[PDB]
Design a binder for this molecule. Sequence first.
Ligand SMILES: O=C(O)CCCCCOc1ccccc1CN(C(=O)c1ccc(-c2ccccc2F)cc1)C1CC1
Ligand SMILES: CCCCCCCO[C@@H]1O[C@H](CO)[C@@H](O)[C@H](O)[C@H]1O
Ligand SMILES: CCCCCCCO[C@@H]1O[C@H](CO)[C@@H](O)[C@H](O)[C@H]1O
Length: 257
Amino acid sequence: DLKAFSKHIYNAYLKNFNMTKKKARSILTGKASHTAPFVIHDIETLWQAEKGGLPPYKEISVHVFYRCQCTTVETVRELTEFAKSIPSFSSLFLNDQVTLLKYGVHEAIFAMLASIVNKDGLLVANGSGFVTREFLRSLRKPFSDIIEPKFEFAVKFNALELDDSDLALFIAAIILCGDRPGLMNVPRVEAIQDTILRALEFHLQANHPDAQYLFPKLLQKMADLRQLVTEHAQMMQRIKKTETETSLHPLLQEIYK
Ligand SMILES: O=C(O)CCCCCOc1ccccc1CN(C(=O)c1ccc(-c2ccccc2F)cc1)C1CC1
Ligand SMILES: CCCCCCCO[C@@H]1O[C@H](CO)[C@@H](O)[C@H](O)[C@H]1O
Ligand SMILES: CCCCCCCO[C@@H]1O[C@H](CO)[C@@H](O)[C@H](O)[C@H]1O
């Protein structure tokens, strides 16, 4: 049953991800709690944020880079358990599960990223802090170059105004993608992806009645995410080749192997 298929993915989304877009958006607006997030806009406030774990300190731009690794790695662990909560996904052999996570987590991460982003920055520390975009721009290359492209995508992505129910299905479609290199059972995954996209279109018709061309637009965003991630990978291989003092989390090294 497709209606129940969708609802199961929605529950897995709520059960496995720390913050919903509804949570984040209320913070970024200021309705939620009378204590707004602590703004990190420069070195001082960055230091104050740390006061109130990671590899040896090298410098500020690299410190930010490590904080980013921690969030990506943490989000990978949530995507893994969210995917595992999808019965269709757990029926695949374990190696096929790894292939899809290896080549899908980053696409899923930059799509979820938009939920905690606005034109001015993003949330950190579970909504307790807000890092400004101008500050992340002030970092030295190539760390400023690896951050700014995501904001440009996030702002155009938020213009679609998806709610958490849309995103749950949207993320499952990104993970269950038959195009990944080295997949063993392509037709199985192709079928699963087709069921999700069908349920996604069915969902959007109900959830966004007066939103036209929303489904083809999201398919275009999926294509955009492949471009964004591929560019991100090149910049990562740049850091690995030119930033000797910058280490990489082993899990991410396996993804970029
Ligand atoms: O290849 C990989 O996967 C690793 C390299 C990723 C580097 C690029 O990361 C990004 C690019 C654009 C936008 C956001 C991010 C990082 N993310 C965060 O949520 C996030 C977390 C913490 C801080 C932050 C905390 C305290 C002090 C200053 C900080 F900057 C900032 C952003 C997204 C999960 C990817
Ligand atoms: C199901 C448990 C037994 C699984 C044994 C099959 C191992 O396959 C390996 O899967 C990896 C991606 O997942 C690839 O990177 C490797 O090249 C491939 O050799
Ligand atoms: C939690 C899983 C998400 C992270 C996936 C990382 C997978 O890395 C790959 O694992 C394969 C066998 O495990 C190796 O054959 C590949 O060389 C390696 O690139």
